[PDB]
Amino acid sequence: HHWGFGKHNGPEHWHKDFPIAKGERQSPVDIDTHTAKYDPSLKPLSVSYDQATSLRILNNGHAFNVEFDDSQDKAVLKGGPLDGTYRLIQFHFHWGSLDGQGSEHTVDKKKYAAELHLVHWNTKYGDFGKAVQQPDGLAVLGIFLKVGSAKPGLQKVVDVLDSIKTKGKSADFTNFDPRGLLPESLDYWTYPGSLTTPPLLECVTWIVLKEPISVSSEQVLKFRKLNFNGEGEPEELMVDNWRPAQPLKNRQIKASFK
């Protein structure tokens, strides 16, 4: 028995094993576009993914991660509200059972079909494990997905999902370019938050892009064929692996645009 997204172990339960779930800077949150403040001081984001080296793609029981080599500054994020260099370690998605839900963050209460998270850690702290223990340890780039036209750059990921259907399964996944998942504009909101699954550590600077990226219904449908369970166990479909919006509390959401 452990945390998950079921009826008896879902987000509403998590606080029993992870008290920080009721913390002061939990994520996700609803972004109220009229209360967000434009900050002229925010510099443009600097995304350098030209040397990214993907290694593998694995089904960890609550989502699937596409892991990168983070032993050097190959794929990094700089600028924006960040101070220093953040290395990309993995990206994953959260999606729903229906096109009307799936994203973790919402915009004026609007939910998207899914949300892509590109996780980076602050190199000053030496490794990922140390970085999550710091208030400025992680930077997570969030991108919304809406259902419409297919996204060519995502098909490579969609095609290998069959090989990692169940929990614990992994597959080699080299030469994948994450630049094919980025929207045209890099305008963003940003706020201090946490990691949206256990252990919900409040070490994250969140950078949520304003412009969604479109994926086809067929592509999202393949996400919904994955399993939370391990092979040989009763099938439960991996859907609705998103945490509901949390109280903003004493936080301000800033926008890089007006």
Residue of minimal CB distance from Zn ion?
A: 117
User: Rounded to the nearest whole angstrom, what is the least distance from the CB of residue 16 to Zn ion in the complex?
Assistant: 21
Rounded Cα–Cα distance for residues 177 and 86 (Å): 18
Rounded Cα–Cα distance for residues 182 and 19 (Å): 35
User: Rounded to the nearest whole angstrom, what is the least distance from the CB of residue 93 to Zn ion in the complex?
Assistant: 8
Whose Cβ is closer to Zn ion: residue 117's or residue 167's?
117
Based on the residue annotation, tell me whether 62 is a catalytic residue of this protein: yes
Rounded Cα–Cα distance for residues 29 and 7 (Å): 22
Catalytic residue among 8, 13, 15, 62: 62
Q: Is 20 exposed, middle or buried (0-12, 13-18, 19+ CB in 10 A)?
A: middle
Helix H or strand E encompassing 31: strand 30-31
Q: Does 117 show up as a binding residue in the annotation?
A: yes
Nearest to 118 by CA among 144, 95, 92: 92
Q: Does 197 show up as a binding residue in the annotation?
A: yes
Q: In 164-216, which residue ranges form alpha helices assigned H by DSSP?
A: none
Whose Cβ is closer to Zn ion: residue 87's or residue 117's?
117
* Site track 114-133 with Zn ion (rule: CB under 5 A), x = hit: ---x----------------
Q: Does 92 show up as a binding residue in the annotation?
A: yes
Q: Is 108 exposed, middle or buried (0-12, 13-18, 19+ CB in 10 A)?
A: exposed
Whose Cβ is closer to Zn ion: residue 39's or residue 56's?
56
Interactions with Zn ion, residue window 181-240 (CB under 5 A): none
Look up residue 131 and give its two tokens: 């970085």
Whose Cβ is closer to Zn ion: residue 105's or residue 210's?
105
Whose Cβ is closer to Zn ion: residue 43's or residue 157's?
157
User: Rounded to the nearest whole angstrom, what is the least distance from the CB of residue 107 to Zn ion in the complex?
Assistant: 17
- Interface with Zn ion by CB under 5 A: which range of 4-12, 113-121, 217-225, 229-237? 113-121
- Interface with Zn ion by CB under 5 A: which range of 19-27, 112-120, 180-188, 209-217? 112-120
Look up residue 133 and give its two tokens: 């223990």
User: Rounded to the nearest whole angstrom, what is the least distance from the CB of residue 196 to Zn ion in the complex?
Assistant: 5
User: Rounded to the nearest whole angstrom, what is the least distance from the CB of residue 191 to Zn ion in the complex?
Assistant: 15
- Interface with Zn ion by CB under 5 A: which range of 6-14, 109-117, 172-180, 233-241? 109-117
Rounded Cα–Cα distance for residues 52 and 155 (Å): 18
Letter string b/e over residues 29-50, b meaning 16 or more CB atoms within 10 A of that residue's CB: bbbeeeebeeeeebeebebbbe
Q: Which residues bind Zn ion (CB under 5 A)?
A: 117
> Which residues are tagged catalytic?
62
Annotated binding-site residue numbers: 92, 94, 117, 196-197
